[PDB]
Amino acid sequence: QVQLQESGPGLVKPSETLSLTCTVSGGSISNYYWSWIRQSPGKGLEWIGYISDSESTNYNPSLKSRVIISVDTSKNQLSLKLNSVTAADSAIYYCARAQQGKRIYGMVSFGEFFYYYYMDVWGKGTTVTVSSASTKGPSVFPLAPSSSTSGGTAALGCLVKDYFPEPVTVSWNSGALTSGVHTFPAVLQSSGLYSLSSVVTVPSSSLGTQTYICNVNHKPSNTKVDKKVEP
Amino acid sequence: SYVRPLSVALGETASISCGRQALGSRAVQWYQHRPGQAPILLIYNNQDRPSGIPERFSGTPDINFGTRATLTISGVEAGDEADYYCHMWDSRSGFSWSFGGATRLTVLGQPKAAPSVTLFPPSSEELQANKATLVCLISDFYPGAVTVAWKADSSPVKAGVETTTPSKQSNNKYAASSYLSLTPEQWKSHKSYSCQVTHEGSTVEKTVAPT
Amino acid sequence: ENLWVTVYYGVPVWKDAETTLFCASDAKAYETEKHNVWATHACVPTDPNPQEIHLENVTEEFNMWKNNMVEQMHTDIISLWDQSLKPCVKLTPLCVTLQCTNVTNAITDGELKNCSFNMTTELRDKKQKVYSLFYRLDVVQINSNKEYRLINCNTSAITQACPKVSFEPIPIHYCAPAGFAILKCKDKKFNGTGPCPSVSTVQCTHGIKPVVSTQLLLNGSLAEEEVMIRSENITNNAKNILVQFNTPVQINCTRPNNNTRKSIRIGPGQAFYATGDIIGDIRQAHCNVSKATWNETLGKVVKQLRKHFGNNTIIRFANSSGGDLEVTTHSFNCGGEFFYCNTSGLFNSTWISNSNDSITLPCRIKQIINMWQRIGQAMYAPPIQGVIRCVSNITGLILTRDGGSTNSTTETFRPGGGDMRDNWRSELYKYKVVKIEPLGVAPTRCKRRVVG
Numbered sequence: 001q002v003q004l005q006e007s008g009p010g011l012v013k014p015s016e017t018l019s020l021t022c023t024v025s026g027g028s029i030s031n032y033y034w035s036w037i038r039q040s041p042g043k044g045l046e047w048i049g050y051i052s053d054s055e056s057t058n059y060n061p062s063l064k065s066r067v068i069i070s071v072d073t074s075k076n077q078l079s080l081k082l083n084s085v086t087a088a089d090s091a092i093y094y095c096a097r098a099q100q101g102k103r104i105y106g107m108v109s110f111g112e113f114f115y116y117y118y119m120d121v122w123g124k125g126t127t128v129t130v131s132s133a134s135t136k137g138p139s140v141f142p143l144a145p146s147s148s149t150s151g152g153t154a155a156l157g158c159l160v161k162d163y164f165p166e167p168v169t170v171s172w173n174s175g176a177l178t179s180g181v182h183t184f185p186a187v188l189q190s191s192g193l194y195s196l197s198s199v200v201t202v203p204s205s206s207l208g209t210q211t212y213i214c215n216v217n218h219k220p221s222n223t224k225v226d227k228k229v230e231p
Numbered sequence: 232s233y234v235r236p237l238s239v240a241l242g243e244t245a246s247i248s249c250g251r252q253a254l255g256s257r258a259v260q261w262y263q264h265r266p267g268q269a270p271i272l273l274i275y276n277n278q279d280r281p282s283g284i285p286e287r288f289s290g291t292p293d294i295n296f297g298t299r300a301t302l303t304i305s306g307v308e309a310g311d312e313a314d315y316y317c318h319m320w321d322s323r324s325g326f327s328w329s330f331g332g333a334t335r336l337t338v339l340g341q342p343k344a345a346p347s348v349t350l351f352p353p354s355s356e357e358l359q360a361n362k363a364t365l366v367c368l369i370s371d372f373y374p375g376a377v378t379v380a381w382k383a384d385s386s387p388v389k390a391g392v393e394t395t396t397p398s399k400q401s402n403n404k405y406a407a408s409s410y411l412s413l414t415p416e417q418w419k420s421h422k423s424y425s426c427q428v429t430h431e432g433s434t435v436e437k438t439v440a441p442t
Numbered sequence: 443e444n445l446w447v448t449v450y451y452g453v454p455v456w457k458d459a460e461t462t463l464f465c466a467s468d469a470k471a472y473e474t475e476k477h478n479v480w481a482t483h484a485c486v487p488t489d490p491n492p493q494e495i496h497l498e499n500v501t502e503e504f505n506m507w508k509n510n511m512v513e514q515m516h517t518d519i520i521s522l523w524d525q526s527l528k529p530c531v532k533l534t535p536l537c538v539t540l541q542c543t544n545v546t547n548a549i550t551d552g553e554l555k556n557c558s559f560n561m562t563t564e565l566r567d568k569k570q571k572v573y574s575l576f577y578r579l580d581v582v583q584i585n586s587n588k589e590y591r592l593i594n595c596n597t598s599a600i601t602q603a604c605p606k607v608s609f610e611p612i613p614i615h616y617c618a619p620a621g622f623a624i625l626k627c628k629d630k631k632f633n634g635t636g637p638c639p640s641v642s643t644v645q646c647t648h649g650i651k652p653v654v655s656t657q658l659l660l661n662g663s664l665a666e667e668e669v670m671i672r673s674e675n676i677t678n679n680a681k682n683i684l685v686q687f688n689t690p691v692q693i694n695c696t697r698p699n700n701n702t703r704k705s706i707r708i709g710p711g712q713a714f715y716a717t718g719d720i721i722g723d724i725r726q727a728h729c730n731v732s733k734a735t736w737n738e739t740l741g742k743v744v745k746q747l748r749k750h751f752g753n754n755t756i757i758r759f760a761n762s763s764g765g766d767l768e769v770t771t772h773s774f775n776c777g778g779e780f781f782y783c784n785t786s787g788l789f790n791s792t793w794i795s796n797s798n799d800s801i802t803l804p805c806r807i808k809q810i811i812n813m814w815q816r817i818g819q820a821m822y823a824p825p826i827q828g829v830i831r832c833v834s835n836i837t838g839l840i841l842t843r844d845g846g847s848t849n850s851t852t853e854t855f856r857p858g859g860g861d862m863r864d865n866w867r868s869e870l871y872k873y874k875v876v877k878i879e880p881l882g883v884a885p886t887r888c889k890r891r892v893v894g
């Protein structure tokens with residue numbers, strides 16, 4: 001019944017302050033704890049810090065010097081700020097609701113209890129790249145149907161030429177068509193820009209004309225591009 | 232540092248040992264993580280599973296010390312394949328910031344699926360832009376290991392070829408794509424272009440030609 | 443009308459006498475584990491059935507404070523302790539400088555210390571670096587890593603208690619030789635000293651367990667009817683106060699740490715028993731006492747206390763405030779480990795105008811000990827493997843007044859343990875030693891056959 005939404009730039013210059021925001025819709029921030037976890041390619045996920053309901057921070061010793069966590073009272077959102085970032089700090093960033101547990105192995109008065117934490121609810125996760133390279137808006141070229149298998153069946157698609165950085169979101173007819181869609185992961189060319197493709201499998205009897213349009217959005221480029229596809 | 236591998240026959244139960252075993256009484260969390268997706272914790276306290284998790288996953292209570300925290304998965308299937316992390320909290324050690332070393336679970340005996348290849352010629356609008364790209368798309372293939380060789384005519388291209396490493400989709404099959412960058416004049420010169428995809432011992436070839 | 447003296451041999455006449463008594467205890471083979479110091483290789487077996495002979499009409503004066511059986515028993519325990527320590531391994535080479543770090547924890551709490559040190563091996567030329575676990579009380583620092591030494595090394599030498607011998611107290615019957623006898627007061631309401639109207643005679647006392655204890659008395663015998671308050675002089679603060687319960691309270695003492703014993707060889711034949719690393723959690727030793735029963739028992743104590751301090755007066759209880767650590771805490775032995783307990787929770791009360799909730803007491807542990815105020819040869823108690831838990835009857839108490847104050851305003855009672863003999867007096871209060879004088883001459887109208 002709790003939803004977490006990560007929003008941020010997705011691209012930050014090296015040696016600059018990275019900011020992120022995690023909006024909660026399910027419940028008040030001041031009842032449960034919150035924590036930030038990042039997942040860099042080729043490495044395991046890393047717990048960087050958490051914030052309590054009473055607004056008390058605690059950070060991982062390895063990154064303790066550079067990380068500041070905050071929570072807003074007016075808005076159910078928690079902010080993450082990282083200073084002096086490098087290419088290693090670029091990763092998928094998750095915010096999660098952490099619940100506190102008390103584990104008792106002896107009698108409480110002398111001590112003999114330790115607190116443990118666990119994050120039951122996660123957000124979808126936002127990606128962040130760190131590079132000096134500039135933003136590059138995508139170029140959209142349609143992929144005409146080959147006219148492919150003895151019918152039903154035929155295939156069309158859309159090509160997203162080289163862009164930067166990840167990710168690119170692709171919908172079809174503003175989300176009206178969901179069947180047969182398959183958006184492949186992008187390729188990092190030697191140019192330094194990603195390139196992806198998105199295909200739809202439809203019956204040749206559907207043609208025509210069913211007026212298939214694909215919609216492409218690149219958040220860093222601030223550009224939304226719609227392209228019509230036809231034989 | 233890096234991941235430890237585990238292999239299980241399909242439909243047979245499996246136990247996942249936990250590195251850095253505890254010194255005293257412990258509360259362990261078992262997280263299921265898929266690359267690119269949000270981690271899902273299976274067991275927050277060693278017995279205990281959150282709502283929605285199937286009963287097949289289980290962990291060891293430390294009723295009597297000396298027991299080893301393991302993760303048991305019954306009826307192992309494709310969806311179970313993943314990375315599993317063991318978050319350890321014992322009484323002797325201090326605050327445990329890091330999760331365990333990842334454990335890459337692979338399911339053996341999965342039925343192989345032939346790749347579905349679809350080659351797309353460059354768009355006319357791309358040709359007006361003075362660039363050309365042949366796009367070879369490969370979907371629904373297991374095991375996720377393919378090799379892509381481009382041909383013009385007989386000849387292989389060997390230049391301007393960029394291929395993605397296979398990635399798993401929701402179908403639990405892999406998906407890969409290959410891009411051949413060409414100049415529009417080179418696209419018009421040759422009779423046809425061919426994308427050859429080799430999966431296990433089989434090989435599938437698709438051909439496209441200029442209009 | 444003519445009276446002549448006549449000799450009678452075997453007349454019931456006795457006089458107060460101090461003689462050398464001897465031990466007696468029932469024989470348990472104990473073929474598996476053996477040689478507790480008190481039973482020794484041998485202590486004379488008890489008679490299958492003891493004879494307690496009631497003495498009608500007999501009224502004899504007792505004095506538990508001028509009793510010599512106490513002093514004899516005291517010297518016997520001391521001498522027995524030395525006789526059991528002589529053959530064991532003396533840890534003269536263990537006074538090497540120790541480099542110690544704390545045992546691992548999150549630092550929310552940690553007395554016990556991980557100590558590494560060099561040690562002579564069996565071959566004289568070779569050396570070994572070993573590590574042992576030492577409680578904080580056993581070691582003191584001098585200067586770096588840090589550097590430590592055992593607390594005893596500047597006062598005295600040290601010897602390690604043999605692992606086989608057991609510190610469990612077993613009942614010991616003190617017996618008088620032929621021609622002597624033991625008189626036993628059977629008065630329930632018997633004051634410490636005075637004439638006892640009901641007296642019986644025995645050849646040997648009851649089974650007395652030599653429980654070494656401080657503050658509260660353990661595993662003793664309980665007075666029938668009312669609880670008994672016994673002093674040498676009540677109005678003198680300097681003289682301690684003996685308290686005997688009619689109802690026993692229960693006290694459970696546990697050391698939860700699951701210790702391990704590491705035998706490291708330090709010479710030909712010699713073997714030091716180091717403390718290996720703890721297995722499991724780090725928990726400190728403790729003792730619970732049911733708050734309800736201890737409140738009832740404390741209530742019955744103050745009822746008998748006011749019989750000597752006025753029907754109404756302020757009677758409060760405070761913690762010990764005198765002496766070193768070994769006299770301030772309820773010291774005792776359980777399973778071979780020596781416990782020292784903060785008793786402030788039991789003696790924090792004030793009495794006026796006439797759930798389970800078990801009280802919990804923190805207890806620290808020492809492995810180097812000098813009992814009975816012994817200066818000189820100290821003893822290292824070898825570590826005990828596994829978790830420790832013993833249940834003990836707490837039968838008595840030892841108290842002390844604060845003394846100088848405005849009289850009869852308020853009275854304050856603090857626990858003390860000035861001497862170890864008071865523990866022996868607590869079970870020897872009823873017995874007394876006398877010698878039989880069987881020669882009586884009396885006049886009758888009887889004459890021997892005339893020589894003429």
Ligand SMILES: *[C@@H]1O[C@H](CO)[C@@H](O[C@@H]2O[C@H](CO)[C@@H](O[C@@H]3O[C@H](CO[C@H]4O[C@H](CO[C@H]5O[C@H](CO)[C@@H](O)[C@H](O)[C@@H]5O[C@H]5O[C@H](CO)[C@@H](O)[C@H](O)[C@@H]5O)[C@@H](O)[C@H](O)[C@@H]4O)[C@@H](O)[C@H](O[C@H]4O[C@H](CO)[C@@H](O)[C@H](O)[C@@H]4O[C@H]4O[C@H](CO)[C@@H](O)[C@H](O)[C@@H]4O[C@H]4O[C@H](CO)[C@@H](O)[C@H](O)[C@@H]4O)[C@@H]3O)[C@H](O)[C@H]2NC(C)=O)[C@H](O)[C@H]1NC(C)=O
Nearest residue numbers: 101102104105106107108256277278292293294295694730
């Ligand atoms: C002298 O006198 C002193 C004073 O009395 C006395 O001190 C006692 O010593 C005891 C040991 O000697 C010591 O006992 C242990 O007690 C632990 C605490 O027990 C209480 O709390 C727990 C938990 O309560 C939580 O959580 C429950 C569970 O959901 C919930 O229902 C409650 O509402 C409560 O939640 C609320 O409070 C939380 C704070 O704790 C808070 O976080 C929440 O938000 C919420 O507000 C209860 O379960 C008990 O009923 C008690 O009320 C106890 O946890 C512990 O045993 C565990 O550990 C042992 C060894 O490490 C294991 O052997 C044992 O099996 C237990 O481990 C099981 O449970 C843990 C955690 O639950 C789990 O991690 C393990 O996997 C394992 O699970 C298995 O069993 C559980 C249930 O047993 C099953 O559910 C699972 O399916 C598995 O099968 C010990 O029991 C005691 O704390 C201490 N008391 C005090 C007050 O000092 C001393 O002992 C006396 N000694 C003498 C002289 O004799």
Ligand SMILES: *[C@@H]1O[C@H](CO)[C@@H](O[C@@H]2O[C@H](CO)[C@@H](O[C@@H]3O[C@H](CO[C@H]4O[C@H](CO)[C@@H](O)[C@H](O)[C@@H]4O)[C@@H](O)[C@H](O[C@H]4O[C@H](CO)[C@@H](O)[C@H](O)[C@@H]4O[C@H]4O[C@H](CO)[C@@H](O)[C@H](O)[C@@H]4O[C@H]4O[C@H](CO)[C@@H](O)[C@H](O)[C@@H]4O)[C@@H]3O)[C@H](O)[C@H]2NC(C)=O)[C@H](O)[C@H]1NC(C)=O
Nearest residue numbers: 474475608611660661774775776777778827832833834835
């Ligand atoms: C006031 O009175 C009360 C009541 O009397 C006292 O409470 C007493 O508390 C004692 C603890 O201080 C306790 O003594 C011990 O009890 C342990 C628990 O017993 C349990 O098992 C028995 C069955 O045997 C059950 O009936 C019982 O209910 C319990 O469940 C025992 O484990 C202890 O045994 C050991 O220690 C003593 C002295 O250290 C040895 O003489 C004895 O042989 C045991 O030692 C051997 O075994 C242990 C096992 O790990 C080894 O670690 C150790 O090295 C020994 O092994 C060597 O020697 C053997 C034999 O030669 C050999 O085979 C082996 O190979 C090794 O070489 C111990 O018995 C009393 O039981 C308890 N009283 C009662 C009635 O229960 C209280 O303390 C009193 N208060 C005061 C202040 O004194």
Ligand SMILES: *[C@@H]1O[C@H](CO)[C@@H](O[C@@H]2O[C@H](CO)[C@@H](O[C@@H]3O[C@H](CO[C@H]4O[C@H](CO)[C@@H](O)[C@H](O[C@H]5O[C@H](CO)[C@@H](O)[C@H](O)[C@@H]5O)[C@@H]4O)[C@@H](O)[C@H](O[C@H]4O[C@H](CO)[C@@H](O)[C@H](O)[C@@H]4O)[C@@H]3O)[C@H](O)[C@H]2NC(C)=O)[C@H](O)[C@H]1NC(C)=O
Nearest residue numbers: 453454455495496497498499500501502639640641642643
């Ligand atoms: C401890 O100290 C006490 C007190 O000093 C001693 O008690 C005294 O003992 C002596 C000797 O035994 C008693 O003297 C004798 O008393 C008897 C009793 O008189 C009879 O008549 C009573 C009246 O009818 C009757 O009630 C009595 O009932 C009692 O006694 C019988 C046993 O005989 C018993 O079964 C009953 O249940 C009653 O309890 C009793 O029948 C008296 O008969 C004696 O006279 C005879 O005996 C003497 C020799 O002693 C003889 O010379 C006479 O000619 C006659 O034949 C005698 O007077 C004395 O009464 C007791 N009480 C005192 C002194 O107060 C006790 O003995 C000491 N014991 C020990 C172990 O030291």
Ligand SMILES: *[C@@H]1O[C@H](CO)[C@@H](O[C@@H]2O[C@H](CO)[C@@H](O[C@@H]3O[C@H](CO[C@H]4O[C@H](CO)[C@@H](O)[C@H](O)[C@@H]4O)[C@@H](O)[C@H](O[C@H]4O[C@H](CO)[C@@H](O)[C@H](O)[C@@H]4O)[C@@H]3O)[C@H](O)[C@H]2NC(C)=O)[C@H](O)[C@H]1NC(C)=O
Nearest residue numbers: 251252543544545546555556557558572573575718719720
């Ligand atoms: C008091 O202080 C002493 C030090 O004097 C401590 O004793 C040391 O305890 C540590 C435990 O933290 C020991 O370190 C461990 O040594 C093991 C020995 O390795 C063996 O196995 C390898 C093959 O793998 C052989 O080649 C080798 O010859 C040995 O036979 C290691 O295996 C351990 O590694 C594990 O822990 C590390 C931790 O980072 C992990 O990364 C590893 O993956 C692995 O799981 C570990 O390194 C040390 O040896 C002890 N020294 C001595 C002299 O005893 C006491 O523990 C301490 N006690 C207290 C209460 O504080």
Ligand SMILES: *[C@@H]1O[C@H](CO)[C@@H](O[C@@H]2O[C@H](CO)[C@@H](O[C@@H]3O[C@H](CO)[C@@H](O)[C@H](O[C@H]4O[C@H](CO)[C@@H](O)[C@H](O)[C@@H]4O)[C@@H]3O)[C@H](O)[C@H]2NC(C)=O)[C@H](O)[C@H]1NC(C)=O
Nearest residue numbers: 295296297298698699700701702720721722827828829830
């Ligand atoms: C304190 O810690 C010590 C450890 O130093 C601990 O002693 C150990 O106890 C365990 C009991 O859990 C012992 O393990 C047993 O060893 C015997 C020897 O062969 C085995 O037969 C036993 O097997 C049974 O139990 C298994 C449990 O899974 C069953 O699967 C199996 O079918 C058998 O029924 C068992 O493995 C261990 O040997 C000792 N170790 C030492 C050095 O003594 C002690 O119990 C702890 N005490 C406390 C109070 O915590």
Ligand SMILES: *[C@@H]1O[C@H](CO)[C@@H](O[C@@H]2O[C@H](CO)[C@@H](O)[C@H](O)[C@H]2NC(C)=O)[C@H](O)[C@H]1NC(C)=O
Nearest residue numbers: 542543544545549551552553554555578587588
């Ligand atoms: C072992 O623990 C003790 C605490 O019991 C530490 O003693 C403290 O040392 C610091 C120095 O960093 C002092 O500032 C504190 O005042 C000390 N506390 C006490 C109570 O004395 C000791 O440093 C620890 N040693 C190791 C090696 O960890």
Ligand SMILES: *[C@@H]1O[C@H](CO)[C@@H](O[C@@H]2O[C@H](CO)[C@@H](O)[C@H](O)[C@H]2NC(C)=O)[C@H](O)[C@H]1NC(C)=O
Nearest residue numbers: 580581582583591592593594595596597598766
């Ligand atoms: C033996 O060493 C102990 C220290 O372990 C000394 O005890 C100290 O004595 C002085 C008196 O000069 C006191 O001020 C200290 O408080 C004592 N320290 C402790 C920890 O008790 C003892 O004096 C030494 N004895 C000899 C004869 O050298």
Ligand SMILES: *[C@@H]1O[C@H](CO)[C@@H](O[C@@H]2O[C@H](CO)[C@@H](O)[C@H](O)[C@H]2NC(C)=O)[C@H](O)[C@H]1NC(C)=O
Nearest residue numbers: 632633634635636637671672673674675676750
């Ligand atoms: C125990 O009770 C006896 C009574 O039989 C006390 O003895 C008397 O004590 C008072 C003073 O306390 C003296 O005036 C009497 O002369 C004593 N009588 C005899 C026969 O000696 C004895 O003092 C009590 N002991 C304690 C410690 O109170």
Ligand SMILES: *[C@@H]1O[C@H](CO)[C@@H](O[C@@H]2O[C@H](CO)[C@@H](O)[C@H](O)[C@H]2NC(C)=O)[C@H](O)[C@H]1NC(C)=O
Nearest residue numbers: 692693694695729730731732733798800801833
């Ligand atoms: C000390 O331990 C004994 C037993 O280990 C305790 O006696 C138990 O008391 C409970 C009530 O709380 C009963 O349910 C059990 O049946 C009793 N056990 C036995 C063997 O009789 C005793 O209460 C403990 N006392 C303290 C002060 O901790």
Ligand SMILES: *[C@@H]1O[C@H](CO)[C@@H](O[C@@H]2O[C@H](CO)[C@@H](O)[C@H](O)[C@H]2NC(C)=O)[C@H](O)[C@H]1NC(C)=O
Nearest residue numbers: 761767770771783784785786787790803804806
């Ligand atoms: C025994 O327990 C009492 C109370 O639990 C301890 O008294 C405390 O002393 C410290 C200073 O050492 C104070 O800071 C606390 O405020 C005291 N507690 C109370 C409740 O007043 C006493 O120190 C303990 N004994 C030992 C030897 O540690």
Ligand SMILES: *[C@@H]1O[C@H](CO)[C@@H](O[C@@H]2O[C@H](CO)[C@@H](O)[C@H](O)[C@H]2NC(C)=O)[C@H](O)[C@H]1NC(C)=O
Nearest residue numbers: 660661662663664689690691692833834835836
């Ligand atoms: C500890 O004290 C209890 C008293 O609560 C003792 O149990 C009694 O033992 C005597 C014999 O010595 C019996 O006459 C009683 O009937 C017992 N009490 C109950 C309630 O059954 C126990 O024996 C003592 N344990 C010792 C001295 O080791």
Ligand SMILES: *[C@@H]1O[C@H](CO)[C@@H](O)[C@H](O)[C@H]1NC(C)=O
Nearest residue numbers: 538539540541558559560571
């Ligand atoms: C052990 O002995 C060596 C001498 O070879 C010494 O250098 C070292 O400091 C000693 N270690 C300790 C802990 O005393």
Ligand SMILES: *[C@@H]1O[C@H](CO)[C@@H](O)[C@H](O)[C@H]1NC(C)=O
Nearest residue numbers: 674675676677678679680681
């Ligand atoms: C009894 O104790 C008081 C101390 O209050 C002392 O003055 C008196 O002399 C003592 N009496 C005897 C007989 O010892």
Ligand SMILES: *[C@@H]1O[C@H](CO)[C@@H](O)[C@H](O)[C@H]1NC(C)=O
Nearest residue numbers: 761762763770771784785786
């Ligand atoms: C006695 O209690 C006082 C508190 O009134 C405390 O300061 C002192 O440390 C205690 N002493 C002992 C030996 O418990």
